[PDB]
């Protein structure tokens, strides 16, 4: 009757080859390897919410936006009095490296870098100005412009 | 019962041959390579708004 006992041990040996302790070892190594593949190299960019004044006079350098791959950046447009300035339209140079979402009435354009460091620029025609605003979108910086408060040079329809 | 032991060492070295060091280094070299992809020739043009 001892053959039943051998077969039983070989049974726990093959049917459940991974005894509960190996189950948690292998859970753990899966867990660590996944931490590693999910681990961002170096310096994750610092999430900063900034405000800047847009100079439209000739000779002024267009405002910069620091991005990061796969993260949303909210560009909000305000006039000199800080009031909202709803967006008329926009033209996005290089839309293959940045993706732009914008509900057609509001004054917020939201940008994500679909690529790590490929930078470009963006023209934004606003309601009240004959002159739109050009902005340079550079991803892969040591911080993310999580939101930016664009203080345009002119005055909007809100005062 | 040590057969299970050496088998399991061979296991975590084949199913996850990427020990958590070489995968982070592999990510490192990947993003450095695509940074070399991204790096423009020399100085980029200066962004100027003229009249």
């Amino acid at each position: 009757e001892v053959i039943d006992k051998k077969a039983f041990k070989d049974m726990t040996r093959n049917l459940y080859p991974l005894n509960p302790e190996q189950v948690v070892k292998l859970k753990q190594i899966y867990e660590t390897s996944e931490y590693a593949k999910a681990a961002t190299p170096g310096t994750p960019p610092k999430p900063t919410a900034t405000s800047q004044f847009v100079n439209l006079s000739p000779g002024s350098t267009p405002p910069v936006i620091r991005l990061s791959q796969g993260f949303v950046s909210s560009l909000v447009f305000l006039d000199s009095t800080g009031a909202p300035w709803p967006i008329a339209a926009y033209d996005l140079g290089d839309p293959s490296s940045f993706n732009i979402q914008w509900d057609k009435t509001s004054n917020t354009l939201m940008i994500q870098a679909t690529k790590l460091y490929n930078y470009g620029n963006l023209a934004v025609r606003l309601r009240g100005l004959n002159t739109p605003v050009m902005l340079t979108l550079i991803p892969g910086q040591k911080a993310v412009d999580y939101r930016v408060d664009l203080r345009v040079q002119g005055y909007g329809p809100n005062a | 019962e040590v057969i299970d032991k050496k088998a399991f060492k061979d296991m975590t070295r084949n199913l996850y041959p990427l020990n958590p060091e070489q995968v982070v280094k592999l990510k490192q070299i990947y993003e450095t390579s695509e940074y070399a992809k991204a790096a423009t020739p020399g100085t980029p043009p200066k962004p100027t708004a003229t009249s």
Binding site: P41, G42, T43 | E21, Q22, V24, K25, Q28, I29, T32
Partner: peptide, 16 residues
């Protein structure tokens, strides 16, 4: 341990 320069720099032996 591996750095972000791409070259591997490791300590020798340290416990606690």
């Amino acid at each position: 341990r591996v750095s972000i320069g791409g070259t591997v720099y490791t300590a020798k032996k340290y416990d606690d």
